[PDB]
Design a protein around this ligand. Structure first.
Ligand SMILES: Nc1ncnc2c1ncn2[C@@H]1O[C@H](CSCC[C@H](N)C(=O)O)[C@@H](O)[C@H]1O
Ligand SMILES: Nc1ncnc2c1ncn2[C@@H]1O[C@H](CSCC[C@H](N)C(=O)O)[C@@H](O)[C@H]1O
Ligand SMILES: C/C(=C\Cc1c(O)c(C)c2c(c1O)C(=O)OC2)CCC(=O)O
Ligand SMILES: C/C(=C\Cc1c(O)c(C)c2c(c1O)C(=O)OC2)CCC(=O)O
Lengths: 395, 394
């Protein structure tokens, strides 16, 4: 498509965004990027891909070491000049200004008259779960992507056969062990990974938001405490950000919210008597011990595993399901291979870089669920959201 | 506000359809400001730390399996995943997953299971861009990745000497300078020399119409009895910059002389249709070509510290003819009040390779005055990184 027709689509996406139409914000972002690629000459692509973005990753990472975004957030509308920020961060004034000006040029912070100002983006990155996300992404993920050309050249350009132990993660970090086992051995990145899961898709519609999955008519209507006093199980729910979101959307809750994850994750959950869920340890490769609950939910869990493991994860739910009663809710990307979206390719390559795994199409997922003993009732999606919601039941 | 940027984008769009200077670049910048006004922090994290590191890695891998060349030859027929996996020697599934990110990142296009090369991908199939990609992912990328750890360990100090105490040395585990690391790590010297023909390719040159007035300042008043040399390109690489000049102002009234390192000069194809003399010259020694009409440098002293940049320019001074010899310095002039990507890009490229920096107008004036030169005028062009600084004997 020519720039002229992208300019038209961009203006068409604009109106839809002003009219608050769902997904239009992401479509405005998409039309903006297509314009840039339609206008850039090859030398500008090279500078942006290989200079701006690597320097941007490095400076954003460095900012978490010197409290930069926290300082700019605190300054609110007054801002700080390079002399005041260098003093607070303990940095050479000239080095700071050169790194800060790239953040300006990269649209992360702003600057008027030698004063630097925080933005909505940088004030958000000042929160501690984004700070650890940044560290994880530059310290753990970046070496793995950088190893892609030499690793796949060294392995004959093959998909990782075993997955978890023969992927580019092992080669970049020089270990024989899997990504989950590496986290146990390399503090503080397990803490960084666990905080990072409350951030990697935050600020986007949840599966349980209006116009996505119908929680009230499918789960709440027909809830039967005489079958089980448990409303929802989040299997692999991390520190509980998703199940807590659910609790505040649908209170007063008629049944229990049960969180299951690894022992180390569960213990890292700070005590809180306003918390609406129970934090319990459970191995997803063991049979589900919470029986006949109304809903079993999974978000970004089996997409990190091979076919055999993912069928194991799903089939471990089967003994717990009450026929006609228990829903299985799978919150995962559904790849539409005829229409590659960046949100799908992003997570796909992140799976390859960490778990040696991939994102699945609708046909792939149905194969997984059929062999597990389940079958799809409906699939739900939302404009602009990466994940789908797959409702399944006993086959 | 997003709505503000949306209106501003449409304004620059109409100026772009009118073919105005720098409008194409302003449309790109307006589009980037729109993305930043709309993206939530998680979207920025995914694009910065997932999309972009994966994109660089796939584009680098593509230079190992002839991807962009296969898609270029395909032209309008295209190639599906099975056809390209066979041609590249790759697993069909691995290839398809890597190519769909290139599609999602707008580098190639996909329709009904067929992949198509683009103007961008076809150009990247050319060997100087192929070697540019390899240099950037192999040499430049590890230096950037070391910025947090290196500056944390050195106390967040600007490198004190420049070329041997910077992130490049720490990232590549050597105690020698970047140029010497190239001498001892083939073929990255050859990759660097080809890269110097691509890093700013396709953007208007200093000599283009509306940029520097070459004919008025250089051709008019050219005097063979003072010297028969029209322009010396000092540090001009393999001569791409000086070849462009000769083809814009031919029939040339005087000689063109290229100057660079012996290793650069001896790698230039011998060519009868060549319009310039390829000669070896150390920029840290006195300029041996006397009284030429124009002495020109492009992206040369910006790689060096203040003391050495003064020397580089001052070595031109004993050769200049007062009232006749121009000094034309084609370098970025940083506007610290208006930080643009073109300057901050190359500034940190200097830090990551040379331990140096780009300079403001006041910075350059100090170097030229210490070298014994005075600025005549500074020329700039909308959307171009570098300025053209004309100077002369003080
Ligand atoms: N064998 C296992 N037993 C229990 N939890 C596991 C597990 N293997 C992986 N997990 C958990 O599954 C999660 C995958 S990351 C997804 C986290 C969360 N559902 C979110 O969407 O943000 C991690 O928290 C990880 O700790
Ligand atoms: N001491 C020296 N003597 C001669 N050339 C030198 C030199 N030190 C650096 N150079 C040259 O300066 C060049 C800087 S890269 C700039 C190349 C070209 N002017 C362009 O803009 O495309 C390199 O080609 C390098 O070989
Ligand atoms: C499935 C799994 C990890 C896979 C996984 C994710 O799910 C998500 C959301 C993310 C990453 C990742 O590698 C990542 O790099 O960015 C986000 C288990 C990990 C463990 O058990 O430690
Ligand atoms: C001045 C100099 C190198 C500085 C320099 C450049 O000018 C340009 C344009 C570039 C780089 C660079 O490091 C780079 O990494 O990407 C483009 C001399 C090098 C030598 O003598 O080998």
């Amino acid at each position: 498509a020519s720039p002229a027709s992208i300019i038209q689509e961009l203006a068409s996406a604009a109106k839809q965004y002003e009219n608050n139409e769902s997904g239009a914000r992401e479509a405005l972002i998409a039309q903006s990027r297509a314009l840039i690629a339609s206008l850039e000459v090859p030398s500008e692509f090279i500078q942006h891909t290989f200079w701006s973005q690597p320097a941007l990753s490095a400076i954003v990472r460095l900012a978490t070491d010197v409290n930069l975004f926290q300082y700019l957030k605190d300054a609110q509308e007054e801002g700080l000049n390079a002399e005041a920020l260098a003093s607070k961060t303990g940095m050479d004034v000239s080095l700071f200004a050169r790194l800060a000006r790239h953040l300006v040029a990269m649209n992360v912070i702003t600057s008027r008259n030698g004063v630097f100002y925080g933005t909505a983006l940088s004030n958000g990155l000042a929160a501690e779960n984004y700070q650890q996300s940044i560290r994880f992404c530059h310290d753990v993920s970046r070496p793995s992507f950088g190893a892609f050309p030499s690793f796949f050249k060294g392995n004959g350009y093959k998909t990782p056969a075993l997955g978890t132990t023969d992927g580019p993660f092992q080669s970049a970090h020089k270990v024989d062990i899997s990504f989950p086992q590496w986290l146990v051995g390399n503090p503080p990145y397990l803490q960084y990974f666990n905080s990072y899961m409350s951030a990697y898709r935050a600020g986007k519609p949840n599966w349980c938001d209006n116009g996505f999955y119908p929680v009230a008519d499918r789960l709440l209507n027909g809830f039967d405490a005489s079958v089980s006093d448990v409303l929802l199980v989040d299997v692999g729910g991390g520190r509980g950000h998703d199940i807590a979101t659910f609790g505040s959307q649908f209170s007063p809750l008629p049944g229990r919210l049960v969180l299951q994850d690894r022992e180390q994750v569960i213990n890292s959950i700070p005590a809180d008597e306003s918390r609406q869920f129970e934090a319990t340890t459970h191995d997803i490769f063991t049979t589900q011990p919470v029986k006949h609950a109304r809903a079993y939910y999974m978000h970004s869990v089996p997409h990190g595993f091979g076919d055999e493991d993912a069928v194991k994860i799903m089939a471990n739910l089967v003994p717990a399901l009450a026929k006609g009663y228990s829903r299985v809710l799978l919150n995962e990307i559904v790849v539409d291979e005829e229409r590659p979206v960046m949100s799908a390719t992003n997570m796909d390559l992140i799976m390859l870089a960490h778990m040696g795994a991939k994102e699945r199409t609708e046909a792939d997922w149905r194969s997984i669920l059929t062999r597990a003993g389940l079958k799809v009732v409906n699939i739900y999606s939302y404009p602009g959201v990466a994940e789908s919601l797959i409702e399944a039941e006993l086959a």
